[PDB]
Structures are given as structure tokens and as C-alpha cells.
Ligand binder design. Structure first.
Ligand SMILES: *[C@@H]1O[C@H](CO)[C@@H](O[C@@H]2O[C@H](CO)[C@@H](O)[C@H](O)[C@H]2NC(C)=O)[C@H](O)[C@H]1NC(C)=O
Ligand SMILES: *[C@@H]1O[C@@H](C)[C@@H](O)[C@@H](O[C@@H]2O[C@H](CO)[C@@H](O)[C@H](O)[C@H]2O)[C@@H]1O
Ligand code: MAN
Ligand code: MAN
Ligand code: MAN
Ligand code: MAN
Ligand code: FUL
Length: 871
């Protein structure tokens, strides 16, 4: 039978327009005579099916509704608001572009707020940083602003000599964002030096460099070897798979670089690709970040505080962006020559070289052309194979291009090392230029990390904002997980970059979604891959809570690897928590009896003094200060409060105190006495009052020599008194007198004894005046006015004076003259009419008696002239 007698219908339309439908067509069979007779039913196929439109349907970015508005209390009154990427762009879908989090102007719950409570016995840099007072006036900027050193009068040097800092030491203190493979903000302070002077010596470079406190180990010895120039081969990039965990870049050897990988994945699509990598680290330093008590950076520490206590996904994640994900525990500093070469697997297979051979040809070619390798034998296996043959014997130039994974130096210079047709990169000149840059701009290389979380350990609520942080981090990485991705054409393994999913191709496949396969590639299996996690479960009676993934997404198929890991995961679950805990002076001392301390407190500083004083009627005897001992104990003098006591008065060896005591009690008297010829000038009895006497003449007291009817004017001889000679008879100077001389208009001092004696004859020429030595006084003037009365006056008195003025009267052995009232003018009074009274302010008539009685008593008037007055 001829089957095409019954012709095909048209293919139907494809059941789908993408993601691979089917279509069919069938013979147009009529059961006619010819049909039944030619066994057409037994021998003809009657239908055809085939797949169609197997191109992937493009998937467009899908964001979600926004979250609840976010309160604001920065000095920037803006409101943060977030939505997230539900579905990531794929296979040429529309990428997402309306930014994830949008902020606006805000209404403040509280006006601009700043904090002030931080430093107790610590010192406050005016920057606000709080450092150990120990670190003050020590010849070193420990504050930053050097405030801790401003006007220091003298300083305790930490370091004997000025040592210089490791240059670029800060780079080992900056944060590391794992996912993005780039260093972020300064996170450790690595200039901080604690006052402690640790140092370390460069090989063959003069003076030691100054190690900072955070570096437990620094190294300057640099090894050179072949081992250092390493090459790997990659049949495809799916190999790179090795939650971010603390690792080493010696172990992983799988680098993410913001563009690096993506370029290479994009390259891998252009055609069936294999990759040869070749790198060589170029060190200037080892270094080991000391494990605990790291000195954070200002800016980091500040920001790491303005973080709320209650969990807050939005603002926590922000630290990762700003500061990173890890921080360097150990590493080196310099640069890394690192190039991923891209080779077309058809070329390689046509070259017939094995991986080991090809890796080698790139090794020795790099060595000759880029590194300045002294000289070497040519190797025809690398030079005359079918690939190198088409490029003047270069194997490297058989590549499509190189991608640069170089770290170190300025990017301009790294980029040049990456060859492509007609470009630079296989010229020594080029390599040396980069190499310069790498000294001028090192980078941390060959380095292990640690989660940035283990750094936030000594703030107010460390343990709080620590677990607050692991949460904000888990959810951070959640956001970058490839599970969100639709699966890929041939066991391609999806990887999320930003908000789109690039397909990483298995060797033997290319095309923009790894759809095209080369004639070698055969498989048709499908390895399993986790769908996304599930949502957390309600917290249980037990801490127990739950989460769940399903090995769907690409469901495992046709003998393809079931996805490996867990379908479920259990963590436990049921405030402001501090971090765990890792001189003091003395109490008020006890006075000695009858005293008290001059300063009451509950607590004294070690080394403080307090003074002991005494109640009234007592005085301290002994050192009067107690000192606070480090002990918490008081150092005490033998001090006490003794009762007041007078001591022994001013001893002139002449006098004799009695009772003789060395100390007298308040209330007891002494009797000062002198020998027979002598008598005490002052009183004979002083008494002890409050530790002084009544009162101690301090030498103004010694025993001077102090112990008949003739009346002492004349001396006896023949039972009859006769006038004594003044220059021959007068011995013991009588009291010194002040006598006046009418004949000489002159006064002078004289001994009474002589005066007396002289009186016998000339006395009507010399008049007494004042007791004591001559000296200006009212008496003088008075004795003047007296003597002026002059002639006409007669005197019959003998007090011992013994002369008495007319108006006065001797007191009869009482020893001095007295005044009179005008009433008693018995004896005749010469007529001194003219006199001014003063009271009546007039001139009236008055006798010498009345005139005399007024000048003696009050001396309160002026005598105009003897003889009649105006009145
Ligand atoms: C850090 O660098 C130091 C050198 O500064 C390295 O110490 C050397 O280690 C090698 C072998 O590991 C020894 O042969 C040398 O004797 C060591 N030199 C000194 C001066 O110690 C050290 O290995 C490096 N550490 C890391 C992490 O690689
Ligand atoms: C047919 O034409 C294609 C180019 C796309 O426009 C298709 O849209 C997609 O259709 C598939 C059908 O399997 C849906 O699953 C996709 O979500 C839809 O975007 C169209 O059907
Ligand atoms: C269906 O198959 C083809 C159509 O492409 C025809 O050649 C054949 O004869 C039958 O009709
Ligand atoms: C089925 O449809 C195909 C195109 O999809 C044609 O090539 C064929 O001739 C038949 O009509
Ligand atoms: C889920 O994740 C694991 C690795 O953690 C894969 O092996 C699996 O295929 C899917 O990606
Ligand atoms: C499974 O999915 C969840 C959400 O993406 C993550 O928490 C986890 O890291 C894993 O990707
Ligand atoms: C080169 O040959 C290919 C086929 C593989 O066996 C590689 O491992 C080898 O290096």
C-alpha cells in the first residue's frame, strides 16, 4: 500500500507559544475500496507528533506591595518604606527598576535627639570618643582629634622612640561584604595603640614598624616559588559551588567579583566554553587579627549604636551595606595576578591537548611573556598544535579572551592585563605598570574572614543587638538565594545577580539560557533543586519552631541527582540584655576621743587625707591627718585630744615661779617672786586660763630694788635737820620728776630727791611740774598756766608734792591737790575781771579763786587780761 495516497493534514498550531508545546498532524484517511483492499490499515503510520516553541518563556521581575511605614528619629526627618522582589527577572524577562525602598518627609515623635551618658572614670575626647585616662598625656594621639593630649604639661612616653605605622594597615581593618566580594567601611580602628608599645621589624628596611593593638601578628618575610604561580582548568563554571560562612581564600579558591563571574557566565553563553585560570599572589605582609577585645572604629561604633533594640529588618541590614559581612581575621597585603581565560571547547578538542597540557601552555607562555621569566626552552607541544598553529605559535591567543579577577593596584591597570584580540596584556611593560600600582595601592589578599557579628560584643546590649543582627543577616542572604529562580534548559544551574537569574551552563551547552548543545553533549536527565524555604511555624509549647523546603522547582528526573540537604529545619524559640561580666577606698574613720573628723563622707579615695580636730577645751597632740590606705584601711598618727594647759611662763633666771610645774591646769596660779633686795614690778600672781595666763609680761617684769620727822627735805645732824646737798646726798633716783625753770624759761627731768633738796634755797626759782620724765601733755600746759599766776601767790602745803596751787587744797596725807567750787572763795582773790565764760559767750568779772577753780576743773574759758573787764 502507498500511504501518501491519504495525505497529511496541516500541523496543528503549537499547543504553546513557549516553554515547549506539541503539535500534530495525521493522514487524511477515507476507508474507500483502495484502503480496505491494500491493507493500508496494517502498514501505514497515520500520525506525527513533534515538540515546538521550546524556547523559554521570559519571566518578568515581580516586586510586592510595600510594608508599613517606618518611624524616623534621625536628624534627617525622612520615612523609610520597603517592598521586596517576589519574582526575579529571567530569560530576557523585563528587569525590575522601581527602587526597593522609598523615603519621604516625616513627622518627628521626638525633636532631634543626641546621647551624652558614656564615660565614668574614662577620659572624653572632644570628639566624644571615650578612652582610658591612662592614655592621656602620653605623647600619642589616642583620641583621634588629639584632644587627649592638648595642653599636657608633662607626659609619660609609651614608646622610647618614634616608630612609623605600617602603611595601609587600615585596609586590614575594613569590613568585607562576602556576597559582593568587595571591602566596605572602616570597621576596626587599627591606629589605636592602647599605650602599649608593640613593634615589629621589616626585613632589610631600617626602623621597625609600629604594630597596632588589633594585630596579634605581622609578617614581612615573603616566599617566592613556582608553587606561587598556579593554574586550574574548568570544563564549565558550574563547578564553582565549592549561607555565607567564615572561610579561607586558600581553601575556597572560588571567587565572586561584582562583574567578574557575570562576565564569564555571559562569555560562556556565546559558545561551548572551557576555562583555564592562572593566578599568582604577590605579598608584602602576613597578618593575624588578634581574636578578642578588638578596638572598633569610631564611625562603625557610632552607627552600630544608633541601632534600635527591638528587631528591625530595615535598619540592621543597612550595616551590611555600609560595613560589610565579615572582617579580616588573617591575610596578606599586596596584589594578585588572576585571569580566567576563556577557551572554545571545539578549539581545545581540535588542539588535542589534555587539560594538563593546556594548563601548562598557559603557564609557560604567561611566564615568558608577562612575568619576566629569565629564558627557557621552547616546547613544540605548546607551539605547533592545531590551535597555536593559527596564532603564530601562541596558545594563549587561541582564547576568546581573558576575564580579570585581579585584586590590587588601580583598576585601570588590572584591566589592561586582561587580553583580547588586538589589545594589551601579554606585554611585560603592561605587567610592570600594574606591579607599581600594587605597591602604591595594596589590597588584602589570601585572607580568612569571620562574620561581622562577632565584633558587636561590648556595647550596651551586645547579646541583644548581636542576635538582633544574625537575624538581619540570615534574611539578608535569604534575599540572594537562587531558589527564587526558574530552572534552566539543560541542568543549567541558576545564579541570582541583583534581581535577575543568569543560567550557568553545563559543559557542552551554551546560548543565552544554555539551550544550544554541541554534538558531543548527550544527557537528557534533570537534577533536583530546592524550591524556596517555607514560612516559619508558630512558636510551640517547646522552644520548637519549623521551616520547610520541597525538592521541586526542577523536580529530579530521568536518573538525575535528587537535590541534597534537608526538607525541614528546626530552631528553638520561647527586652535589653547586657554582655556577660568577665581602687575602692575607705569608710569614715573613727576620731580619737574628744575629737571629730573635719570631713564626713561615706567613702574616701585611696591616698586621701582627713584632718582630726578637737572639741573645745581640747587641742590635738600628734600628727593630725589620717590617710586612706589602698587596703581600705586608715593610716593613723598617734593623735589625741589633750585638755588645754598653760606651759611654763617666760623664765628670767632672776625670778622664781612657784609651784614649779612643767604643765599647769586651767584654774591654777603661780606666784612669781624675787630675792630680798628685790620686788616684782608687775603683779605677783598670774593664773592659767584657757592655755594662756593673765597675762605673761614676756620680760616686762623683773625685780627692781624696791623696799625721820625731818620730813625728808632735810637730813639730820645735831638733832636738827639741815639742807642736803643734791650732788652728794641723792642716791636712789627718786621717781623722775619734770621740773620747770622760771629763770631759764626751760624745763627738764630731775630726781625728786635733788628737787626737794634744791627747794630749800632757790626753790622760789624752780617749780615742780609733772611726775615722770618730761613730756608733752595737758599737765605741762596746765602747769604752765599755773606758774604764770606768778607773783602775789603764797603756798602752805605738804602732800609730798608738796606744792599746791592757790585754788587747790592738799588732801592731808592723801597726797594730791583737789579743786574747788567758786562758792568757797575764803582767801582774798586778786581782781581778774576780764574773762570769757564760753557758756554765756560773754565777758564778766571774776576773782582768781573763781577763775582758778574753773581752769583746774574744766579749763573751759579764756582769760582776756588781769584788771577790770568790759562788763
Ligand atoms: C606568615 O608569614 C610568616 C613570615 O613572615 C611565615 O612564617 C614562615 O613560615 C615558613 C613555613 O610556613 C617557615 O619556613 C619560616 O621559617 C617562617 N618564617 C618566619 C620568620 O616565621 C608564615 O608561614 C606566614 N603565615 C601564613 C598564615 O601563611
Ligand atoms: C505565547 O507567546 C509567547 C511569546 C509568550 O507571549 C506567551 O506568554 C506566556 O505564555 C505561557 C504559556 O505556557 C505562560 O505560562 C506565561 O506565563 C506567559 O507569559 C504566550 O502564551
Ligand atoms: C505529509 O508529509 C509531507 C508534508 O510535508 C507530504 O510530503 C507527504 O506527502 C504527506 O502528505
Ligand atoms: C506542518 O507545518 C510545518 C510548519 O510548522 C510545515 O512545514 C509542514 O509543511 C506542515 O504544514
Ligand atoms: C538546594 O540546595 C542544595 C545545596 O544546598 C542543592 O544541592 C540543591 O540542588 C538545591 O540547589
Ligand atoms: C531557603 O529559603 C529561605 C528564603 O529564601 C532562606 O532563609 C534560606 O537561606 C534558603 O535560601
Ligand atoms: C586531559 O584530557 C582530558 C580528556 C581529561 O582526561 C583531563 O583530565 C586531562 O587533563
Amino acid at each position: 500500500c502507498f500511504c501518501d495516497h491519504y495525505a497529511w493534514t496541516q500541523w496543528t498550531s503549537c499547543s504553546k507559544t513557549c516553554n515547549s508545546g506539541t503539535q500534530s498532524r495525521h493522514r487524511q484517511i477515507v476507508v474507500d475500496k483502495y484502503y480496505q483492499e491494500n491493507f493500508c490499515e496494517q502498514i501505514c503510520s497515520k500520525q506525527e507528533t513533534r515538540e515546538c516553541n521550546w524556547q523559554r518563556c521570559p519571566i518578568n521581575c515581580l516586586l510586592g506591595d510595600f510594608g508599613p511605614w517606618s518611624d524616623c528619629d534621625p536628624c534627617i526627618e525622612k520615612q523609610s518604606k520597603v517592598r521586596s522582589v517576589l519574582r526575579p527577572s529571567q530569560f530576557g524577562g523585563q528587569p525590575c527598576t522601581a527602587p526597593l525602598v522609598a523615603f519621604q518627609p516625616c513627622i518627628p515623635s521626638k525633636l532631634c535627639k543626641i546621647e551624652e551618658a558614656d564615660c565614668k572614670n574614662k577620659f572624653r575626647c572632644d570628639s566624644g570618643r571615650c578612652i582610658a585616662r591612662k592614655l592621656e598625656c602620653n605623647g600619642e594621639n589616642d583620641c583621634g582629634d588629639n584632644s587627649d593630649e592638648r595642653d599636657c604639661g608633662r607626659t609619660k612616653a609609651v614608646c622610647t622612640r618614634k616608630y612609623n605605622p605600617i602603611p595601609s594597615v587600615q585596609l586590614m581593618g575594613n569590613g568585607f561584604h562576602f556576597l559582593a566580594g568587595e571591602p566596605r567601611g572602616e570597621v576596626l580602628d587599627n591606629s589605636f595603640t592602647g599605650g602599649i608599645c608593640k613593634t615589629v621589624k621589616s626585613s632589610r628596611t631600617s626602623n621597625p614598624y609600629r604594630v597596632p593593638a588589633n594585630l596579634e601578628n605581622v609578617g614581612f618575610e615573603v616566599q617566592t616559588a613556582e608553587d606561587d604561580l598556579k593554574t586550574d582548568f574548568y570544563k564549565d563554571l558550574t563547578s564553582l559551588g565549592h549561607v555565607p560562612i567564615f572561610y579561607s581564600s586558600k581553601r575556597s579558591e572560588n571567587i565572586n567579583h561584582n562583574s567578574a563571574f557575570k562576565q564569564a557566565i555571559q562569555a560562556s553563553h556565546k559558545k561551548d566554553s572551557s576555562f583555564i585560570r592562572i593566578h599568582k599572589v604577590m605579598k608584602v605582609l602576613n597578618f593575624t587579627t588578634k581574636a578578642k577585645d578588638l578596638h572598633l572604629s569610631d564611625v562603625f561604633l557610632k552607627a552600630l549604636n544608633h541601632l534600635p533594640l527591638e528587631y528591625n529588618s530595615a535598619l540592621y541590614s543597612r550595616i551590611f551595606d555600609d560595613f560589610g559581612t565579615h572582617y579580616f581575621t588573617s591575610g596578606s597585603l599586596g596584589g594578585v595576578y588572576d585571569l580566567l581565560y576563556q577557551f572554545s571547547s571545539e578549539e581545545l578538542k581540535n588542539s588535542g591537548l589534555t587539560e594538563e597540557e593546556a594548563k601548562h601552555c598557559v603557564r609557560i607562555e604567561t611566564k615568558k611573556r608577562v612575568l619576566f621569566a629569565k629564558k627557557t626552552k621552547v616546547e613544540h607541544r605548546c607551539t605547533t598544535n592545531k590551535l597555536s598553529e593559527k596564532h603564530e605559535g601562541s596558545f594563549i591567543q587561541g582564547a576568546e579572551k581573558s576575564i580579570s579577577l585581579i585584586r590590587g593596584g588601580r583598576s585601570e591597570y588590572g584591566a589592561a592585563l586582561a587580553w583580547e584580540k588586538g589589545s594589551s596584556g601579554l606585554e611585560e611593560k603592561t605587567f610592570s605598570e600594574w606591579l607599581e600600582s600594587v605597591k602604591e595601592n595594596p589590597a588584602v589578599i589570601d585572607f580568612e574572614l569571620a562574620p561581622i557579628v562577632d565584633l558587636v560584643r561590648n556595647i550596651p546590649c551586645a547579646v541583644t543587638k548581636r542576635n538582633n543582627l544574625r537575624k538581619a543577616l540570615q534574611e539578608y542572604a535569604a534575599k540572594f538565594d537562587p531558589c527564587q529562580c526558574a530552572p534552566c534548559p539543560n541542568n543549567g544551574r541558576p545564579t541570582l545577580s541583583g534581581t535577575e537569574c543568569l543560567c550557568v551552563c553545563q559543559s557542552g551547552t551554551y546560548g543565552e539560557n544554555c539551550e544550544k548543545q554541541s554534538p558531543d553533549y548527550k544527557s537528557n536527565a534533570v537534577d533536583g533543586q530546592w524550591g524556596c524555604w517555607s514560612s516559619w511555624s508558630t512558636c510551640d509549647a517547646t522552644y520548637k519552631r519549623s521551616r520547610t523546603r520541597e525538592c521541586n522547582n526542577p523536580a529530579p528526573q530521568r536518573g538525575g541527582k535528587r537535590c541534597e540537604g534537608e526538607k525541614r529545619q528546626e530552631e528553638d524559640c520561647t527586652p535589653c540584655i547586657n554582655d556577660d561580666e568577665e581602687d575602692s577606698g575607705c569608710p569614715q574613720p573613727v576620731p580619737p576621743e574628744n575629737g571629730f573628723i573635719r570631713n564626713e563622707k561615706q567613702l574616701y579615695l585611696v591616698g586621701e587625707d582627713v584632718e582630726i580636730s578637737c572639741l573645745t577645751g581640747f587641742e590635738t597632740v600628734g600628727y593630725q591627718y589620717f590617710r586612706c590606705l589602698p587596703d581600705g584601711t586608715w593610716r593613723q598618727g598617734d593623735v589625741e585630744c589633750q585638755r588645754t594647759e598653760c606651759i611654763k611662763p617666760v623664765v628670767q633666771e632672776v625670778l622664781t615661779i612657784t609651784p614649779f610645774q612643767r604643765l599647769y591646769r586651767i584654774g591654777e596660779s603661780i606666784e612669781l617672786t624675787c630675792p630680798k633686795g628685790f620686788v616684782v614690778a608687775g603683779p605677783s600672781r598670774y593664773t592659767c586660763q584657757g592655755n594662756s595666763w593673765t597675762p605673761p609680761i614676756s620680760n616686762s617684769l623683773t625685780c627692781e630694788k624696791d623696799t625721820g620727822h625731818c620730813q625728808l627735805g632735810q637730813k639730820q645732824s645735831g638733832s636738827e635737820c639741815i639742807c642736803m646737798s643734791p650732788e652728794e646726798d641723792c642716791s636712789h633716783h627718786s621717781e623722775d620728776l619734770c621740773v620747770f625753770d622760771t629763770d631759764s624759761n626751760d624745763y627738764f627731768t630731775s630726781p625728786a630727791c635733788k628737787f626737794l633738796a634744791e627747794k630749800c634755797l632757790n626753790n622760789q626759782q624752780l617749780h615742780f611740774l609733772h611726775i615722770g620724765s618730761c613730756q608733752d601733755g595737758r599737765q605741762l600746759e596746765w602747769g604752765l598756766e599755773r606758774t604764770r599766776l606768778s607773783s602775789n601767790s603764797t603756798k602752805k602745803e605738804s602732800c609730798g608734792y608738796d606744792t599746791c596751787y592757790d585754788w587747790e587744797k592738799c588732801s592731808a596725807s592723801t597726797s594730791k591737790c583737789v579743786c574747788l567750787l567758786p562758792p568757797q572763795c575764803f582767801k582774798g582773790g586778786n581782781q581778774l575781771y576780764c574773762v570769757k565764760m564760753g557758756s554765756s559767750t560773754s565777758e564778766k568779772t571774776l576773782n582768781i579763786c573763781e577763775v582758778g577753780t574753773i581752769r583746774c576743773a574744766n579749763r573751759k574759758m579764756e582769760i582776756l587780761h588781769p584788771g577790770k573787764c568790759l562788763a
